[PDB]
Amino acid sequence: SKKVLLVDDSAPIRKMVSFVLKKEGYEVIEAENGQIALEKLSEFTPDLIVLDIMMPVMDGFTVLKKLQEKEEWKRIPVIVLTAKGGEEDESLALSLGARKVMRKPFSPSQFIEEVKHLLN
Amino acid sequence: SKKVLLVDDSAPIRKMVSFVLKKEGYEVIEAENGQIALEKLSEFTPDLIVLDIMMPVMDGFTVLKKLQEKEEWKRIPVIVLTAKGGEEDESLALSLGARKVMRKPFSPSQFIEEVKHLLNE
Amino acid sequence: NVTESKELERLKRIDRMKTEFIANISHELRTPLTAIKAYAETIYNSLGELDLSTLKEFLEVIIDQSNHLENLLNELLDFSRLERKSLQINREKVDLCDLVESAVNAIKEFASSHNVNVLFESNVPCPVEAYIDPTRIRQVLLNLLNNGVKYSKKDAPDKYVKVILDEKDGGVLIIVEDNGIGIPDHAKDRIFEQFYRVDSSLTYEVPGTGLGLAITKEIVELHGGRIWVESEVGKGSRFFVWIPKD
Amino acid sequence: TESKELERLKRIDRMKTEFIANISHELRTPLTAIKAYAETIYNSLGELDLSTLKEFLEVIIDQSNHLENLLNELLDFSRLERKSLQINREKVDLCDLVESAVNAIKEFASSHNVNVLFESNVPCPVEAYIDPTRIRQVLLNLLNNGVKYSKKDAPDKYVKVILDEKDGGVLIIVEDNGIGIPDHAKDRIFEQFYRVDSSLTYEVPGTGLGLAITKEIVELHGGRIWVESEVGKGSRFFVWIPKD
Ligand SMILES: Nc1ncnc2c1ncn2[C@@H]1O[C@H](COP(=O)(O)OP(=O)(O)O)[C@@H](O)[C@H]1O
Numbered sequence: 001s002k003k004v005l006l007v008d009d010s011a012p013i014r015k016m017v018s019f020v021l022k023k024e025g026y027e028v029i030e031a032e033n034g035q036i037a038l039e040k041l042s043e044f045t046p047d048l049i050v051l052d053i054m055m056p057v058m059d060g061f062t063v064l065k066k067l068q069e070k071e072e073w074k075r076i077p078v079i080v081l082t083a084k085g086g087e088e089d090e091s092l093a094l095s096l097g098a099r100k101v102m103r104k105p106f107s108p109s110q111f112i113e114e115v116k117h118l119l120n
Numbered sequence: 121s122k123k124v125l126l127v128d129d130s131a132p133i134r135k136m137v138s139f140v141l142k143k144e145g146y147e148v149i150e151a152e153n154g155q156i157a158l159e160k161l162s163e164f165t166p167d168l169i170v171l172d173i174m175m176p177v178m179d180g181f182t183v184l185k186k187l188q189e190k191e192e193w194k195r196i197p198v199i200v201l202t203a204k205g206g207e208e209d210e211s212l213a214l215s216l217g218a219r220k221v222m223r224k225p226f227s228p229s230q231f232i233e234e235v236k237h238l239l240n241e
Numbered sequence: 242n243v244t245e246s247k248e249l250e251r252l253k254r255i256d257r258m259k260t261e262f263i264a265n266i267s268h269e270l271r272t273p274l275t276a277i278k279a280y281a282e283t284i285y286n287s288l289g290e291l292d293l294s295t296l297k298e299f300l301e302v303i304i305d306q307s308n309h310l311e312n313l314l315n316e317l318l319d320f321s322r323l324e325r326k327s328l329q330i331n332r333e334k335v336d337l338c339d340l341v342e343s344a345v346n347a348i349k350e351f352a353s354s355h356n357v358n359v360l361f362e363s364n365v366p367c368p369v370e371a372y373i374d375p376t377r378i379r380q381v382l383l384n385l386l387n388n389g390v391k392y393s394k395k396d397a398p399d400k401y402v403k404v405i406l407d408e409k410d411g412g413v414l415i416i417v418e419d420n421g422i423g424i425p426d427h428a429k430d431r432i433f434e435q436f437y438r439v440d441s442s443l444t445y446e447v448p449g450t451g452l453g454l455a456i457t458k459e460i461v462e463l464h465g466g467r468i469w470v471e472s473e474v475g476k477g478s479r480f481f482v483w484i485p486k487d
Numbered sequence: 488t489e490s491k492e493l494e495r496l497k498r499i500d501r502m503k504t505e506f507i508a509n510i511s512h513e514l515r516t517p518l519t520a521i522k523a524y525a526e527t528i529y530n531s532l533g534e535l536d537l538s539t540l541k542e543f544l545e546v547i548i549d550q551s552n553h554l555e556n557l558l559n560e561l562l563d564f565s566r567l568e569r570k571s572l573q574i575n576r577e578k579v580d581l582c583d584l585v586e587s588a589v590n591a592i593k594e595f596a597s598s599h600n601v602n603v604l605f606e607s608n609v610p611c612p613v614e615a616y617i618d619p620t621r622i623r624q625v626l627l628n629l630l631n632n633g634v635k636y637s638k639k640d641a642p643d644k645y646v647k648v649i650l651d652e653k654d655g656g657v658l659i660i661v662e663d664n665g666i667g668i669p670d671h672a673k674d675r676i677f678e679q680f681y682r683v684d685s686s687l688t689y690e691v692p693g694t695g696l697g698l699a700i701t702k703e704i705v706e707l708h709g710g711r712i713w714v715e716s717e718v719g720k721g722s723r724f725f726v727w728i729p730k731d
Pocket residue numbers: 384388389391392393419421422423424432437438439440444448449450451452453454455478
């Protein structure tokens with residue numbers, strides 16, 4: 001069973017997204033901010049990363065930068081799930097390696113469809 | 121155009137029930153307590169009453185009693201919607217002339233079914 | 242600075258008003274929650290059997306009530322952050338013109354309860370762009386506008402609260418002008434203190450906790466600005482709010 | 488006294504502030520959760536599973552209850568300082584009231600390796616004219632204290648509820664082998680905001696209102712509450728309530 005890394009500073013979102021993922025059959029690992037995400041990246045290699053933008057300590061863009069730089073992190077599919085209104089951000093995210101950028105609130109059907117899309 | 125009287129001291133309950141009634145195509149008249157309910161009964165005759173029990177100033181059991189007494193009023197169908205879930209409270213309401221007693225939380229599908237059953241009779 | 246006796250009676254007076262605030266907000270917070278709970282429970286038990294339109298409306302109510310509770314929670318949070326002197330600010334480029342116009346509409350109901358005409362004037366054509374926290378500056382305006390209605394003349398022919406918005410090179414100057422009861426000279430600095438209220442023959446009927454201006458001062462100064470009052474007892478009051486450009 | 492009366496009222500005010508500060512931040516969490524879950528269901532209507540719809544709504548309800556709990560903590564404090572706390576007497580079987588209260592704290596006691604036990608010294612249809620909610624709250628506060636202030640590494644930790652009839656009313660005893668209360672703070676525990684100076688090495692969280700609201704309820708019933716505890720053996724909390 002695949003392993004997903006869920007990165008968001010909002011606890012309800014993590015709980016909400018994890019439930020959807022676990023109901024399918026995936027295992028979930030959580031990170032409260034950008035750096036904790038990098039700290040748990042040293043522990044293991046996930047099959048997918050669900051990344052928020054606005055976080056304390058380290059925001060989403062920085063995570064994307066440092067993802068594409070390392071030997072092993074570069075080839076992990078990243079789905080951005082952000083509450084950002086501006087679509088200038090969407091361009092900046094997709095360029096930095098984001099395989100898709102989805103807006104909040106998240107739709108469990110549209111989301112699960114994309115996860116299966118990137119794991120098959 | 122059927123007109124229903126909605127009697128309950130809880131404002132969220134009224135909004136909740138009123139919407140379900142209006143969406144079915146009825147006119148809704150509200151009362152915050154038992155006395156206001158009877159006051160409005162002088163102005164018009166409703167086709168149905170939805171009635172709470174626990175209310176300030178005047179309670180449902182009093183309302184029921186006064187409804188069953190007056191000549192014009194005693195023919196009006198009354199559904200009781202209440203937080204009182206005891207068998208005793210139900211029976212009392214029933215002998216006092218209530219057509220049905222329903223326990224909260226509000227359950228719209230069952231409510232619509234009973235509202236239809238009574239009005240088309 | 243002060244005697245031990247006076248330090249005691251002050252603190253006791255502050256306690257009464259803290260007590261009265263907490264008591265009120267406790268009750269205000271209960272109402273939205275009741276609604277939230279009622280609606281949540283109603284949905285959950287009729288889960289498979291709700292009409293989609295009815296479910297949609299039941300969720301809207303939950304969201305609206307959630308927002309009202311959130312507003313009321315912020316009142317309590319500010320009260321808490323005020324006595325801890327740690328308030329936050331979030332600046333963004335907003336139009337000040339409709340920002341005050343929002344607050345004017347938000348009070349016209351309460352202003353009519355006392356026969357007070359709400360006026361808005363501007364020296365320079367709209368929009369007046371400013372880099373300010375829109376929620377907080379709206380709150381500042383409301384607080385002042387509220388005071389203009391609350392402390393207006395009990396029986397006067399022409400009551401008004403005016404909002405004068407005049408732009409300058411250094412920033413923007415907001416003047417909230419009332420022809421109310423006015424403020425005695427000794428309490429001119431004191432009004433911006435926490436829980437301070439002027440104790441007079443005319444200001445005794447009126448209810449308050451004395452936070453409005455205390456919070457207002459803090460928001461204004463966090464914007465790196467200045468706030469002061471100019472009034473004459475019996476004539477009326479003018480509150481000045483200066484918000485500079487960066 | 489005036490010189491010290493200011494010092495005392497100034498000490499209370501600091502604790503009152505810290506309480507409001509903490510409870511304000513606590514209320515934010517459930518609210519945020521309710522909002523998120525509601526806006527997510529709303530934004531995704533007719534498109535999600537009945538199973539998902541069910542779970543997301545349970546979260547809205549859990550958080551509503553948590554928010555209600557916290558709002559009650561604040562209101563209980565408000566009614567205490569204002570001395571506005573009231574009671575509503577009715578005939579309730581105390582045997583099943585304490586039994587229902589035991590079953591409510593069972594899950595929490597398991598988390599701290601604590602046994603919950605209820606013992607009756609008299610036949611079980613013990614009835615009194617008391618406030619069922621408020622006395623349940625009294626029972627829960629005492630039970631919670633027994634789990635919270637138990638031994639760190641002890642073999643058989645327990646909290647026991649003993650129901651009997653004393654003089655002419657009802658006597659409830661909440662017993663625990665726990666840390667015990669030092670004899671200098673024996674009277675101080677029922678006061679507002681007061682915690683043991685140790686705080687169990689600051690591990691245990693608490694506002695210190697628990698026993699203050701408990702006492703108030705017990706006394707509004709025309710009863711009294713007292714404690715008997717040995718410094719390091721355990722504690723026995725005594726509640727006596729009349730019957731009409
Ligand atoms: N427009 C005004 N005219 C006269 N007095 C005012 C005015 N605005 C504020 N004040 C004075 O300032 C004091 C504190 O005001 P505020 O901080 O808003 O709290 P509150 O309005 O609840 O008393 C009031 O007691 C009042 O006497």
